[PDB]
Amino acid sequence: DVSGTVCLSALPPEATDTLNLIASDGPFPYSQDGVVFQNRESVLPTQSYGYYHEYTVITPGARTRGTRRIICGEATQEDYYTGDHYATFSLIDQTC
């Protein structure tokens, strides 16, 4: 299940940077950005393979990719944020 919707303005600023890179088709800072997210745990709605893609949301100061990600779906404005490495997701509202 999706935890609710959150205003893009309420997420860390780096989430806005990721969304802007997704709108321009990169380039992305990590080679793992844009790979398929399989939704293996069934947390997001069931869809065909390839419907979802995952992108890193940079954690300031981290040496690794950390735990924040944006997951996009194929629908218009369907983007989810996770701050705990795919345990919970919120739908991102880009209008606020």
Ligand SMILES: Nc1nc2c(ncn2[C@@H]2O[C@H](CO)[C@H]3O[P@](O)(=S)O[C@H]32)c(=O)[nH]1
């Ligand atoms: N938990 C989880 N991670 C996934 C799934 N599909 C892809 N990933 C992730 O996205 C990338 C490719 O498999 C990997 O980098 P990462 O974010 S560390 O975790 C892996 C999935 O269904 N579940």
